[PDB]
TrEMBL record:
This is Peptide deformylase. Removes the formyl group from the N-terminal Met of newly synthesized proteins. Requires at least a dipeptide for an efficient rate of reaction. N-terminal L-methionine is a prerequisite for activity but the enzyme has broad specificity at other positions. Keywords: Hydrolase, Iron, Metal-binding, Protein biosynthesis. Its cofactor is Fe(2+). It is an enzyme of class 3 (hydrolase). Pfam families: Pep_deformylase. InterPro entries: Peptide_deformylase (IPR023635), Peptide_deformylase_sf (IPR036821). Its EC number is 3.5.1.88. HAMAP family: Pep_deformylase (MF_00163).
Length: 171
């Protein structure tokens, strides 16, 4: 399991570089990212979150944890001004959730682990999650859309959760 960076770690603000070739090393990273993400458990993880500053996102929106998806060098284009409220969380802002409004339909262009390009249209949870994970690659967290008090309260509660997770390793 890869360690996940926690807000307010400044390495989460890093702007990810495009992946130049889908090597067997980015394939193993993807594999390690899925295990880390499934174990958390979470439905998405950006390579930025495990301190690997490259345009790689893993995701699995299924209950069964058996619909895995990879997005490498993604471009996300909204297809509407209409937004959709969603209560977002983030493995890098542990146990914090709040409402974010994002465009409700998007185009995703990305490459898969075979280096093949694809283009799909996303709504509902896929649209929410791809935009959340694209934000990570541009050094942005979902708490940047909240009021500063909400951000400060998130920061203070995450620092407490992280301290408790360290104490749990000593016990
Ligand atoms: O760590 C991340 O970046 C992934 C977030 C993605 C997310 C996007 C939109 C809304 C909520 C979360 C994690 O998946 S949050 C953990 C989680 C686990 C099970 C079900 C829902 C959320
Ligand atoms: Zn996140």
């Amino acid at each position: 399991l890869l360690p996940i960076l926690s807000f307010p770690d400044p390495r989460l603000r890093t702007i990810a570089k495009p992946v130049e070739e889908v090597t067997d090393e980015i394939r193993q990273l993807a594999a390690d990212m899925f295990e880390t993400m499934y174990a958390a458990p979470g439905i998405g993880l950006a390579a930025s979150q495990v301190d690997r500053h490259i345009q790689l996102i893993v995701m699995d929106l299924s209950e069964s944890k058996d619909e895995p998806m990879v997005f490498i060098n993604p471009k996300v284009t909204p297809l509407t001004e209409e937004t959709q409220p969603y209560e977002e969380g983030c493995l890098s802002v542990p146990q914090i959730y709040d409402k974010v409004d994002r465009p409700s339909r998007v185009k995703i262009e990305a490459i898969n682990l075979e280096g093949q390009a694809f283009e799909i249209e996303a709504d509902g949870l896929l649209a929410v999650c791809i935009q959340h994970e694209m934000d990570h690659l541009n050094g942005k967290l979902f708490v940047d859309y909240l009021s500063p008090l909400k951000r400060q309260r998130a920061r203070e509660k995450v620092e407490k959760i992280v301290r408790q997770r360290e104490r749990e390793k000593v016990a």
